[PDB]
Amino acid sequence: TLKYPIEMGIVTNWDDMEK
Amino acid sequence: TLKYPIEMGIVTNWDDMEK
Amino acid sequence: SPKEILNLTSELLQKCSSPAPGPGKEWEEYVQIRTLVEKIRKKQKGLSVTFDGKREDYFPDLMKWASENGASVEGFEMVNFKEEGFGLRATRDIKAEELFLWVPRKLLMTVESAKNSVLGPLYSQDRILQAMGNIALAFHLLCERASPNSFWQPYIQTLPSEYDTPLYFEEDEVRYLQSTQAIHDVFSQYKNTARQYAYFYKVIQTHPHANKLPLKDSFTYEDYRWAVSSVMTRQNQIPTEDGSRVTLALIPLWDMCNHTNGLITTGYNLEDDRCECVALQDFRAGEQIYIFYGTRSNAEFVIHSGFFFDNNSHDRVKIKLGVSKSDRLYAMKAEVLARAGIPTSSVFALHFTEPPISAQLLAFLRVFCMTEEELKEHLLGDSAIDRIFTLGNSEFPVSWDNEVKLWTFLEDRASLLLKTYKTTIEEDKSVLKNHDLSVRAKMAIKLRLGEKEILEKAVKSAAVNREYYRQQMEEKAPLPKYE
Amino acid sequence: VSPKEILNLTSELLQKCSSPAPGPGKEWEEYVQIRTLVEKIRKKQKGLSVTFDGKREDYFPDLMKWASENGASVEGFEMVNFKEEGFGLRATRDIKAEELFLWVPRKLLMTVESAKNSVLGPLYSQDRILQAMGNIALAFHLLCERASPNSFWQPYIQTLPSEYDTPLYFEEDEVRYLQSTQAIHDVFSQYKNTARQYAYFYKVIQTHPHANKLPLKDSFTYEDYRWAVSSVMTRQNQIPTEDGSRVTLALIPLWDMCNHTNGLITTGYNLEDDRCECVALQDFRAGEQIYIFYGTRSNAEFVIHSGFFFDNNSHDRVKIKLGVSKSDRLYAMKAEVLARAGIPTSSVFALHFTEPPISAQLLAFLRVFCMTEEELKEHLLGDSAIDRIFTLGNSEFPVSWDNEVKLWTFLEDRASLLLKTYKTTIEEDKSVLKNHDLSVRAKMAIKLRLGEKEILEKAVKSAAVNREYYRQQMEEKAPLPKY
Numbered sequence A, B: 001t002l003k004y005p006i007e008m009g010i011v012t013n014w015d016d017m018e019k
Numbered sequence C: 001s002p003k004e005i006l007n008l009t010s011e012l013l014q015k016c017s018s019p020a021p022g023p024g025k026e027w028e029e030y031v032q033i034r035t036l037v038e039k040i041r042k043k044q045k046g047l048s049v050t051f052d053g054k055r056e057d058y059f060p061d062l063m064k065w066a067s068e069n070g071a072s073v074e075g076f077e078m079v080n081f082k083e084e085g086f087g088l089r090a091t092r093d094i095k096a097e098e099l100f101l102w103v104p105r106k107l108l109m110t111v112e113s114a115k116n117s118v119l120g121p122l123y124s125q126d127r128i129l130q131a132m133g134n135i136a137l138a139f140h141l142l143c144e145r146a147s148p149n150s151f152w153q154p155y156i157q158t159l160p161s162e163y164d165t166p167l168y169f170e171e172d173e174v175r176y177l178q179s180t181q182a183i184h185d186v187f188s189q190y191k192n193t194a195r196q197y198a199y200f201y202k203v204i205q206t207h208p209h210a211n212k213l214p215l216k217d218s219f220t221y222e223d224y225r226w227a228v229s230s231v232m233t234r235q236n237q238i239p240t241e242d243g244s245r246v247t248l249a250l251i252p253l254w255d256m257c258n259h260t261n262g263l264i265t266t267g268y269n270l271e272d273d274r275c276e277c278v279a280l281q282d283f284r285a286g287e288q289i290y291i292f293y294g295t296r297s298n299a300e301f302v303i304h305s306g307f308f309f310d311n312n313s314h315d316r317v318k319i320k321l322g323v324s325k326s327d328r329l330y331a332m333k334a335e336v337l338a339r340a341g342i343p344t345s346s347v348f349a350l351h352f353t354e355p356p357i358s359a360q361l362l363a364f365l366r367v368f369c370m371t372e373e374e375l376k377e378h379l380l381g382d383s384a385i386d387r388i389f390t391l392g393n394s395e396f397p398v399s400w401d402n403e404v405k406l407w408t409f410l411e412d413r414a415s416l417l418l419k420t421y422k423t424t425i426e427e428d429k430s431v432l433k434n435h436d437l438s439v440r441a442k443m444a445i446k447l448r449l450g451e452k453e454i455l456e457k458a459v460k461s462a463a464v465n466r467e468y469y470r471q472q473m474e475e476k477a478p479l480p481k482y483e
Numbered sequence D: 001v002s003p004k005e006i007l008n009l010t011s012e013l014l015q016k017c018s019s020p021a022p023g024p025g026k027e028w029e030e031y032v033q034i035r036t037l038v039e040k041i042r043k044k045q046k047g048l049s050v051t052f053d054g055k056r057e058d059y060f061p062d063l064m065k066w067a068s069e070n071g072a073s074v075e076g077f078e079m080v081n082f083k084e085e086g087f088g089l090r091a092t093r094d095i096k097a098e099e100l101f102l103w104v105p106r107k108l109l110m111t112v113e114s115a116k117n118s119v120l121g122p123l124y125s126q127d128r129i130l131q132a133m134g135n136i137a138l139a140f141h142l143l144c145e146r147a148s149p150n151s152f153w154q155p156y157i158q159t160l161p162s163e164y165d166t167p168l169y170f171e172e173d174e175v176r177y178l179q180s181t182q183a184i185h186d187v188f189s190q191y192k193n194t195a196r197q198y199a200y201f202y203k204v205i206q207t208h209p210h211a212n213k214l215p216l217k218d219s220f221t222y223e224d225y226r227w228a229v230s231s232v233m234t235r236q237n238q239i240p241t242e243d244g245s246r247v248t249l250a251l252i253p254l255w256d257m258c259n260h261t262n263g264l265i266t267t268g269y270n271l272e273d274d275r276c277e278c279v280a281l282q283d284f285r286a287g288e289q290i291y292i293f294y295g296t297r298s299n300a301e302f303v304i305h306s307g308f309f310f311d312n313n314s315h316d317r318v319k320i321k322l323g324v325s326k327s328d329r330l331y332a333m334k335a336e337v338l339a340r341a342g343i344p345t346s347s348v349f350a351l352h353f354t355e356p357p358i359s360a361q362l363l364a365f366l367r368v369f370c371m372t373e374e375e376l377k378e379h380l381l382g383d384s385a386i387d388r389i390f391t392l393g394n395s396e397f398p399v400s401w402d403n404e405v406k407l408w409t410f411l412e413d414r415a416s417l418l419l420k421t422y423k424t425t426i427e428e429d430k431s432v433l434k435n436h437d438l439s440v441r442a443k444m445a446i447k448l449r450l451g452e453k454e455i456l457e458k459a460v461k462s463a464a465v466n467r468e469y470y471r472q473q474m475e476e477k478a479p480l481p482k483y
């Protein structure tokens, strides 16, 4: 239903050496 | 028993105007 | 700004030194005092001295410092428990009655060490400090806290920074206590603490004996609220080293233990000059080590210790009673009470126990309901003193009629007291079940629920006792006689 | 105390945390080595560079006023410190399911774009890590505004927590509970990533000219960085850009005071009004905590990235790595069948705790993994080949009864094997939780390792049940369903 659902605390990649 | 039992947080009077 | 704070503290001192405004005005006075404190607190920088590390960063230095001065430091660790806060946890099995913890006097903060400290000169001049060792302890704690080289810094840096005494409650959390017995003690404590802060704020400014105190440069309301909350939740009464007087003390390491039901197992050992604690029960490795603080009520635990204890087996409420001067038998009743060592009017207790009343209250209630003929048998003749001797003893009533009168009276009075609360027991249970509440709010609601549950149990006990003695009277049973 | 001493320790830290992975058997040892360096640095620093005078709740009025001024919803809820979740929102009126009760316009948000336009803009324009990692850029945006007293976002930052329960905050013995689990490697990576990032940026900030006007140049502690990334990882959100073409990461004031419960996502971004909008997940009566559903994350993700363990997480899952081996004679046919079905030949699948235990993709993989050559032919050749691949993830249309029995035998055996790789059993975990008194962080770790095994144990039982059902179908020579 929601076009832009907002996930609280969504998991992100913190591995700077991978990125 | 214990000659000097110790009560943690023994209630004291804080009313400086009455005492 | 400094002239502004001195202005505001002057108003607070005069506000909190005014006489009690009458019980019906005490909430309004409370909110007035709160408004003034918060305005001061908002213009100040919180605790004058704060530390860089977390609370648990400093527990090693506490152990090392305690170890160097002869204290036990093996067999337990400090853990932050959700239910009680930080406490001690066994790292080995500890058997009931094992002496597992001891704290030599050198480590304690006492009224004596307060006297010999930088606070010494002011102590000897101020009449409040001299009369009230608990306030002396609180200032001792603040001065040493603000002294970076204090001997007691390893202890001070591990203390809590906040408490759950009613001084820290929000106004709406205290409001739940409206119409209870305890809220007057909450009012007193708030007014006491604000008056004391303003009084000593000005004294430190005006006295030359306070010149060397760190408090001369910074002394905030938060400083004082933290200090008195630290003292009231942790202080202890110990003998002087002389053994002939009692003093008040803070006992490091030991006072990390939290409370459970049991008996007191901590005592002072004069010969080795140290506090000693034996295990209240078996503690397996990995179990929290508890002690029994004392036989205090949940009102005392809330107001003076900052917590509410579920299944407090020593809970009690007050009941004020007195013989009326319009009673035609006042003179006789007063004399019998006096010969029994009981005042004509007093504040007694109702307990959450199988008998709700002590021997002293039972004796008072018997005299309260005595006929003139019964009073004369407690005043005259060679068996009168024998009769007084037994007045507090459930097994030897004055008469079946006397018992029926006193249990009828108590049932009616406890019933009346229940009717003075703003809510019922069922409404309190609904609040706790249907609302999501802070810990402080829950302490307040459980406290007012507990007052009513004790009164309700007193009503039930009194009704049952009334029926028991009414049966003995219908059956004309022989009265027991002490022989 | 020496600035050059910290720069040498961080240089040592950067080298240690930039070395390649040590191999999974050496990761715990490397973890303790990094912890030892970090703790040495941390104990030489002064904690959070910026601390505020008042209590956390002292600042909630300012946040509400600031949110109100910029068009956010500020009526119908209040901030309460709940024991279970920390601070949260509580309804002050009845709020009905699906009512739009909370909305936050974009100007209140902290985003990667507001980072670019702030004092961090120059350093952001040249640093390769900041440009590539919005989550790190947002962490430094947060630290720079925190140390800026006239910052527009100060009302938000003064209400943020000072401490979190991400594993970055655990003691060594608290993480030790997770030895032998799936989750502990990500705990290791988090700790190594954060330590490397702090050391890298500390050196950058102290030398790069585009950082000469950052408040962090005067003070940037490890505690600062641990707080900042924990703030971002427990609270960050992905939202569209203003023009809706791309996505960015954001901190959303006021709304991120809601705690998590089971349910559905009810927060969406309104691009037309340019604001976050939250509708009530369920009815909230006056006095009840307002909850939202964060997302379908596992308890491993909640612990590591959100800092809590959620009891009865309906989306809890563990990983299971599976792949067709090139030593299999049928590798080529299985690989092509998998490919036509959109499934890699080797992957990390999930096992779930709720029904169904395995997803469509894992069921399809397991069927192919156990297929005979003739079955594989039926999925590669002829006019029904594509129909058969269409149903490979459907539990109602098995390939054959024998295929099911082989795949459920395999899953049962592999789930059983995985269970035996944990250093404790499920009953042992339940005993520790029942018989030991534990910190919140300790319980999170033990409940996480317990949850991993309970999901594998449920997979073992479900596979046993399924194996028996399809073996009964076989022996009964039942007609195979057809779609």
Ligand SMILES: Nc1ncnc2c1ncn2[C@@H]1O[C@H](CSCC[C@H](N)C(=O)O)[C@@H](O)[C@H]1O
Residues within 6 Å of the ligand: C083, C084, C085, C086, C087, C159, C160, C164, C233, C234, C255, C256, C257, C258, C259, C260, C305, C306, C307, C308, C309
């Ligand atoms: N049974 C109990 N339940 C909840 N809190 C308790 C408790 N027993 C003790 N406490 C807490 O402990 C205080 C006494 S000092 C005991 C150590 C304290 N928890 C600390 O962290 O320093 C009390 O004021 C109360 O805050």
Ligand SMILES: Nc1ncnc2c1ncn2[C@@H]1O[C@H](CSCC[C@H](N)C(=O)O)[C@@H](O)[C@H]1O
Residues within 6 Å of the ligand: D084, D085, D086, D087, D088, D160, D161, D165, D234, D235, D256, D257, D258, D259, D260, D261, D306, D307, D308, D309, D310
């Ligand atoms: N269901 C839950 N149980 C325990 N903690 C929760 C929770 N939902 C959210 N939290 C806590 O809230 C954080 C998310 S931000 C939510 C507001 C937060 N409680 C605050 O005081 O600012 C999480 O990192 C976790 O600490």
